[PDB]
Amino acid sequence: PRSLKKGVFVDDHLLEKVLELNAKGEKRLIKTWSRRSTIVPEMVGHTIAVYNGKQHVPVYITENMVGHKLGEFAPTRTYRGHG
Amino acid sequence: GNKIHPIGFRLGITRDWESRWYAGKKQYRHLLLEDQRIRGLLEKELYSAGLARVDIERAADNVAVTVHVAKPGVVIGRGGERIRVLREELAKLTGKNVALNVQEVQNPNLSAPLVAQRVAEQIERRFAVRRAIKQAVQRVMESGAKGAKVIVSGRIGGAEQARTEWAAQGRVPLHTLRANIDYGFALARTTYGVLGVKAYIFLGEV
Amino acid sequence: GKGDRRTRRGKIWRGTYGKYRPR
Amino acid sequence: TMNITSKQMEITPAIRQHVADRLAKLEKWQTHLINPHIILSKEPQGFVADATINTPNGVLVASGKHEDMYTAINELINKLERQLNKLQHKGEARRAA
Amino acid sequence: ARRRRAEVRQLQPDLVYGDVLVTAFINKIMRDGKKNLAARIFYDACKIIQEKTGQEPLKVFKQAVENVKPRMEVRSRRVGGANYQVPMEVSPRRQQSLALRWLVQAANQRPERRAAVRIAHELMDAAEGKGGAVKKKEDVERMAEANRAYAHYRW
Amino acid sequence: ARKALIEKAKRTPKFKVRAYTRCVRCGRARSVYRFFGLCRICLRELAHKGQLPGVRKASW
RNA sequence: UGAAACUCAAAGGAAUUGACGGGGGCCCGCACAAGCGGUGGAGCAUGUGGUUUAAUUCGAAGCAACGCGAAGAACCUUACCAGGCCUUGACAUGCUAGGGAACCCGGGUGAAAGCCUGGGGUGCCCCGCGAGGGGAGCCCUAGCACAGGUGCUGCAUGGCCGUCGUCAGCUCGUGCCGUGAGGUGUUGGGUUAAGUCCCGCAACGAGCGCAACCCCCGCCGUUAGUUGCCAGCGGUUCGGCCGGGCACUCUAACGGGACUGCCCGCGAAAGCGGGAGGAAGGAGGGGACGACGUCUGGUCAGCAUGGCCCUUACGGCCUGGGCGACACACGUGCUACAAUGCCCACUACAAAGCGAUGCCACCCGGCAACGGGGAGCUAAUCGCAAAAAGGUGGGCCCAGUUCGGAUUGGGGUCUGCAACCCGACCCCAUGAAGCCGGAAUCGCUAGUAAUCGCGGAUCAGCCAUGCCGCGGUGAAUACG
Ligand SMILES: [Mg+2]
Ligand SMILES: [Mg+2]
Ligand SMILES: [Mg+2]
Ligand SMILES: [Mg+2]
Ligand SMILES: [Mg+2]
Ligand SMILES: [Mg+2]
Ligand SMILES: [Mg+2]
Ligand SMILES: [Mg+2]
Ligand SMILES: [Mg+2]
Ligand SMILES: [Mg+2]
Ligand SMILES: [Mg+2]
Ligand SMILES: [Mg+2]
Ligand SMILES: [Mg+2]
Ligand SMILES: [Mg+2]
Ligand SMILES: [Mg+2]
Ligand SMILES: [Mg+2]
Ligand SMILES: [Mg+2]
Ligand SMILES: [Mg+2]
Ligand SMILES: [Mg+2]
Ligand SMILES: [Mg+2]
Ligand SMILES: [Mg+2]
Ligand SMILES: [Mg+2]
Ligand SMILES: [Mg+2]
Ligand SMILES: [Mg+2]
Ligand SMILES: [Mg+2]
Ligand SMILES: [Mg+2]
Ligand SMILES: [Mg+2]
Ligand SMILES: [Mg+2]
Ligand SMILES: [Mg+2]
Ligand SMILES: [Mg+2]
Ligand SMILES: [Mg+2]
Ligand SMILES: [Mg+2]
Ligand SMILES: [Mg+2]
Ligand SMILES: [Mg+2]
Ligand SMILES: [Mg+2]
Ligand SMILES: [Mg+2]
Ligand SMILES: [Mg+2]
Ligand SMILES: [Mg+2]
Ligand SMILES: [Mg+2]
Ligand SMILES: [Mg+2]
Ligand SMILES: [Mg+2]
Ligand SMILES: [Mg+2]
Ligand SMILES: [Mg+2]
Ligand SMILES: [Mg+2]
Ligand SMILES: [Mg+2]
Ligand SMILES: [Mg+2]
Ligand SMILES: [Mg+2]
Ligand SMILES: [Mg+2]
Ligand SMILES: [Mg+2]
Ligand SMILES: [Mg+2]
Ligand SMILES: [Mg+2]
Ligand SMILES: [Mg+2]
Ligand SMILES: [Mg+2]
Ligand SMILES: [Mg+2]
Ligand SMILES: [Mg+2]
Ligand SMILES: [Mg+2]
Ligand SMILES: [Mg+2]
Ligand SMILES: [Mg+2]
Ligand SMILES: [Mg+2]
Ligand SMILES: [Mg+2]
Ligand SMILES: [Mg+2]
Ligand SMILES: [Mg+2]
Ligand SMILES: [Mg+2]
Ligand SMILES: [Mg+2]
Ligand SMILES: [Mg+2]
Ligand SMILES: [Mg+2]
Ligand SMILES: [Mg+2]
Ligand SMILES: [Mg+2]
Ligand SMILES: [Mg+2]
Ligand SMILES: [Mg+2]
Ligand SMILES: [Mg+2]
Ligand SMILES: [Mg+2]
Ligand SMILES: [Mg+2]
Ligand SMILES: [Zn+2]
């Protein structure tokens, strides 16, 4: 994974909106294309809509899913099985 | 689909490179690009003159372009009119000291690229391709060549079924390294499509 | 052999280094 | 098992199954059909059905051609049978002397 | 091949006994072109057979070879509508190759855990006339005699 | 999608990763030699002509 | 004895050139045989068929498609999908009219693109002490032509390639034979790797192929002597380091050398068999080189190109997704199933290459990946660099193991704007299948196979176990 010497990566344009909502009190839905952004402690309790290439998937962030990436919760392939 | 290019096969044996210089790893590409652009411009402008070979030389910030041609006059102009016009068009592109020479092609009918272009011109003029090819070869042999072979491929005469027509005389030993064979290619654009023209002239073996 | 990273031979085949093949 | 390729064409599972029932005629000869491979294709003239099959006594290679994709397949089968029957019986010819 | 009868490679005599036959055996032991390994195994074996039975290893080895040489073999030939196992005499070149081949193969079917040891012991049994190597030879011969009736089909 | 692409490859990008070599002659994105700026096909085409200095058919 | 209806555009004779034959003769090729190692089974990597999908772009199709185009898909690439946008347009040549040109720097909105906008000084030749007046240097704005299309057709094509096949062949001129297709030559006897050469012959020549001319390797010489070498004499910090020298090794340019030339033998000859000399012998080994043509072979997606089709979109920009999906099926490979083996520790011996936001000595932090210091090298100087098998010692003791290293958990490193999908590497733990593989099937005839490692192109990084090279060690067998 990403070097610890470097940052904990959030796209700033995603993060900024989080803190904005935190101040005034949360929350509206946040449509983002930032799959690469880490879920960050400030984001918990929000519901962020993560674009998977097609649809924006509503993801309610929790205490368990902090360390992860946003993409991990909006799967990019439809697979219901074979035959 | 087989035969090796008869010139590349003879580089540094019977035939010499057209861009003669040295350049290091950091530079080679950029010189080469400029070299080709020089050929790009000149190939368009000097076509009517009878362009056969375009030699290029380089030292340091200065370059010498030697143009071989059947009609030296069409290059030079009236007392140097076009010849001067060239250096300016040239060193604008080059951006450096671009020496432009001209030199005679003693026998255009022994110059393979010339023979090739002539036949290509003839078949864009809707001439009889087979009659043409026999003629071309007849010209080249009369001019003294030890052998000749000329080939035209495509929708010949406009036919829907592509075909290849060739004719040859004397010797054309494409397998012999020490045999000097000038080679040339010419593209003939017609209303029904592209024809390819190949000319082989066997000047002699070394 | 050559497929095991935790061995000298494996690190050679793979062209890397580490505890099991130091430089 | 058996592979079918539809070159620059779309076909259905139905059509694929049809081919399998058609190749099935070769089972007559009670010999192993090893990796049979059918290639369906469209020329301007009609369809083309190609096949390469190996058996303990040789390979079968045949091409069938016809405006009707099914006939093209049927002629492919006909050519394959004739080959398989030769492969299976040519050895018997010279039992004497 | 089709044009001419190929040339038998003349081997270089081995460093320790000066023997082309030993060299040949070494190569047959040799896996993956590790001839140093191959050389040791034989020479180690040569040491072992001396310890177990004090004689000349070279004498043992050579005796073991002469014991595994098939003098007669069967080679198939499909005559008419049947494949007959035709009895044939083995050329001395081929006798050698088969002998050295079976020696190593039978050696490496043995249960003891080190190659030098297996190579040692098999050479000891084959010298005395026992072991899977000689069993191969005996069998090949028996097949040939068994089909003596087809010895007129010989080419 | 071609000429737009031989163009977009020229302009410097938003991030230096997105840069990639195209064949300066034919616009090919694949098998582009750094040393010449050319693809494997053009590399062969010019070399056979003798318009690559020092380059020759290699035989050993 | 002997019709017709109906139906077909032929049915036929002979001969010609092919092709074919479970017809014949004679030959050749790792074609079989003789061998040695694999594939098909396992796990995994990779391409493909399918199936799935919003999309899983596209081509390649028996041999000759399938680690092929792809010599580097996270974004880019990218041609597909979804969504957000642009309209002479990312790009060419124009002609016209407004702005100021030209170039840089920020602000807002936005995922970004884009839309919005606030900055700031244009040379010229010019009336210029003066407002003011351009021209075209280049941009901007509105037009109209036009651009642009990896949209279709490789069955309209050029180019280049694959294949039969490095096979020994394919023909022409004139003469002769035949009403004619066409034959002859080119067949025949001998010979060769070869339509190679010899002899004969209604044929006599010629051409394209064969061979040779070119490259590498093997012996030797000449010319050169550093950044390469060190035989001998001096120093020798204890290292060709210093003096010195270029002998030797080498390096790299030019030559010599092998021609069946020489003897024995058989030959009508061409040649074949054997011998010597020689580093090399009968093409010395390998390479480059591929006839007329075939496969209506391959490629309109490398490029070009006829024609058809798209034009606020079948063009163009961006963000994200996909090309990496997974009931299955096949092709190519990697690693294996172990003792001729595995593991540790110490110790030897290469070649060809590559390297200035590059290769990195050496130092220090870290078990490590790596990080921070830092010298050298436009590199026969310095660096990648250690080659590995091997050698010497020690452990393992026949067990699904100290074989095997898949799968998964956890912790880190580095590249990169960014490693969720979807990177490589390190470390801890986990420790699968697999006990040598059915029908079937591949490679190789000698420095070959097998086995061992090293480099390079592409390349930020890498999914390379691929490809192209390089040397180390080094077989088995060929009756036919
Ligand atoms: Mg292990
Ligand atoms: Mg199938
Ligand atoms: Mg498809
Ligand atoms: Mg289908
Ligand atoms: Mg076919
Ligand atoms: Mg039937
Ligand atoms: Mg039949
Ligand atoms: Mg054996
Ligand atoms: Mg046995
Ligand atoms: Mg007994
Ligand atoms: Mg598009
Ligand atoms: Mg294009
Ligand atoms: Mg890139
Ligand atoms: Mg590129
Ligand atoms: Mg009638
Ligand atoms: Mg007849
Ligand atoms: Mg026959
Ligand atoms: Mg073979
Ligand atoms: Mg075999
Ligand atoms: Mg076998
Ligand atoms: Mg293997
Ligand atoms: Mg297997
Ligand atoms: Mg397998
Ligand atoms: Mg595909
Ligand atoms: Mg598909
Ligand atoms: Mg496809
Ligand atoms: Mg296409
Ligand atoms: Mg790749
Ligand atoms: Mg993409
Ligand atoms: Mg994109
Ligand atoms: Mg074609
Ligand atoms: Mg073509
Ligand atoms: Mg096609
Ligand atoms: Mg007659
Ligand atoms: Mg007549
Ligand atoms: Mg004739
Ligand atoms: Mg004639
Ligand atoms: Mg002929
Ligand atoms: Mg003939
Ligand atoms: Mg003859
Ligand atoms: Mg030959
Ligand atoms: Mg000849
Ligand atoms: Mg004759
Ligand atoms: Mg050398
Ligand atoms: Mg000297
Ligand atoms: Mg001879
Ligand atoms: Mg040749
Ligand atoms: Mg086709
Ligand atoms: Mg195109
Ligand atoms: Mg087109
Ligand atoms: Mg028209
Ligand atoms: Mg994108
Ligand atoms: Mg992607
Ligand atoms: Mg793919
Ligand atoms: Mg299936
Ligand atoms: Mg399977
Ligand atoms: Mg692999
Ligand atoms: Mg496999
Ligand atoms: Mg066991
Ligand atoms: Mg276990
Ligand atoms: Mg088990
Ligand atoms: Mg274990
Ligand atoms: Mg993990
Ligand atoms: Mg990734
Ligand atoms: Mg096996
Ligand atoms: Mg094994
Ligand atoms: Mg079998
Ligand atoms: Mg061979
Ligand atoms: Mg091994
Ligand atoms: Mg490597
Ligand atoms: Mg590199
Ligand atoms: Mg790389
Ligand atoms: Mg992976
Ligand atoms: Zn190109």
Same domain, B181 and B92: no
A37 is a domain residue = yes
Q: Of the ligands numbered here, which is closest to the C-alpha atom of F26?
A: 74
- Nearest Cα of chain F lies from the Cα of B2 at a distance, in angstroms, of 14
The CATH number of the domain holding residue A36 is: 3.30.860.10
Residues of B in contact with F50 (CB under 8 A): 7-8, 11, 15-19
The Cα-based distances of E148 to A70, B30, B118 in angstroms read 84, 83, 83
Dist. CA B106–CA F15, nearest whole Å: 56
Closest CA to D70 of D4, D18, D2, D23: D18
Same domain, B142 and B59: no
Question: Residue E91 carries which DSSP code?
Answer: P
Same domain, B115 and B205: yes
- Segments forming the whole domain that contains residue F42: 1-60
Dist. CA A8–CA A20, nearest whole Å: 19
Phi, psi of E83, deg, nearest 5: -90, 105
Domains of chain D in start order, with CATH, are 1-90 (3.30.160.100)
* Secondary structure (DSSP) of F11-31: S--SSGGG-----TTT---SS
A2 is a domain residue = no
Dist. CA B96–CA B89, nearest whole Å: 12
Enumerate the β-bridge partners of residue B11: B15
Same domain, B88 and B100: yes
DSSP H or E segment with residue B40: helix B28-45
Dist. CA E25–CA E57, nearest whole Å: 14
* Protein CA at B8 to nucleotide C1' at G260, angstroms: 37
Question: Residue B68 carries which DSSP code?
Answer: E
Same domain, B66 and B150: no
How many residue pairs from chains D and E have C-beta atoms closer than 8 A? Answer: 6
Same domain, B150 and B193: yes
What's this structure's resolution in Å?
2.3
Cβ–Cβ under 8 Å, residues E67 and E138: no
- Discontinuities in chain A with C to N beyond 2.5 Å fall right after none
Q: For residue B92, give the 3-state DSSP assignment.
A: helix
DSSP H or E segment with residue E29: helix E20-29
Instruction: Kindly report whether the peptide bond that precedes residue D97 is cis, defined as omega within 30 degrees of 0.
Output: yes
Sign of CA dihedral B29, B32, B34, B37: negative
Dist. CA B43–CA B99, nearest whole Å: 17
Angle at B151 between CA B145 and CA B157, to 5 degrees: 130
Please give the sequence-ordered ranges of beta strands (E in DSSP) within B128-193, or none if there are none.
147-154, 163-170, 179-189
Dist. CA B192–CA B182, nearest whole Å: 30
Enumerate the β-bridge partners of residue F3: none
The CATH number of the domain holding residue B134 is: 3.30.1140.32
Number of domains in chain A: 1
Residue with the two structure tokens 């140093």:
E36
DSSP H or E segment with residue B75: helix B72-76
Same domain, B91 and B168: no
How many angstroms is it from C9 CA to the middle of ligand 70? 15
The CATH number of the domain holding residue F44 is: 4.10.830.10
- Segments forming the whole domain that contains residue A48: 8-83
How many angstroms is it from B108 CA to the middle of ligand 28? 50
F13 belongs to an annotated ligand binding site: no
* Secondary structure (DSSP) of A3-26: -SSS-----SHHHHHHHHHHHH--
Phi, psi of B149, deg, nearest 5: -145, 125
Closest CA to D39 of D13, D14, D55, D61: D61
Closest nucleotide (C1' vs CA) to D55 is G440
Number of domains in chain F: 1
Same domain, B193 and B111: yes
Cβ–Cβ under 8 Å, residues B150 and B136: yes
Query: Chain E: residue nearest D92 by CA?
Result: E81
Dist. CA D26–CA D29, nearest whole Å: 6
Same domain, B116 and B206: yes
A3 is a domain residue = no
The b/e string for D22-43 (b: 16+ C-beta within 10 A; e otherwise) is: bbeebeebeeebeebebbbbee
DSSP H or E segment with residue F49: helix F40-49
Closest CA to A8 of A43, A48, A37, A30: A37
Query: Chain D: residue nearest E81 by CA?
Result: D95
Dist. CA B16–CA B22, nearest whole Å: 15
Same domain, B111 and B206: yes
The single-letter code of the amino acid at B4 is I
Cβ–Cβ under 8 Å, residues B145 and B161: no
Dist. CA F21–CA F37, nearest whole Å: 8
Number of domains in chain B: 2
Same domain, B136 and B63: no
The single-letter code of the amino acid at E68 is V
Domains of chain E in start order, with CATH, are 1-155 (1.10.455.10)
Dist. CA B107–CA B172, nearest whole Å: 19
Q: For residue F48, give the 3-state DSSP assignment.
A: helix
Q: Tell me the HSE value of E124 on the side-chain side, using a 13 A CA sphere.
A: 18
Both tokens assigned to B91: 């060193």
Number of H helices, E strands in chain C: 1, 0
- Nearest Cα of chain D lies from the Cα of E78 at a distance, in angstroms, of 10
Dist. CA B183–CA B113, nearest whole Å: 6
Dist. CA E49–CA E57, nearest whole Å: 6
Cβ–Cβ under 8 Å, residues B137 and B112: no
DSSP H or E segment with residue B34: helix B28-45
Dist. CA B94–CA B37, nearest whole Å: 9
B3 is a domain residue = no
Q: Please tell me whether any atom of strand G lies within 7 Å of the Cβ of F40.
A: yes
Which residues lie near ion ligand 12 (Cβ < 5 Å)? F 2
Cβ–Cβ under 8 Å, residues B164 and B133: no
Dist. CA B30–CA E130, nearest whole Å: 80
Cβ–Cβ under 8 Å, residues F50 and B11: yes
Dist. CA B147–CA B153, nearest whole Å: 21
- Segments forming the whole domain that contains residue B65: 16-106
Residue with the two structure tokens 């049978």:
D81
Cβ–Cβ under 8 Å, residues E94 and E68: no
A1 is a domain residue = no
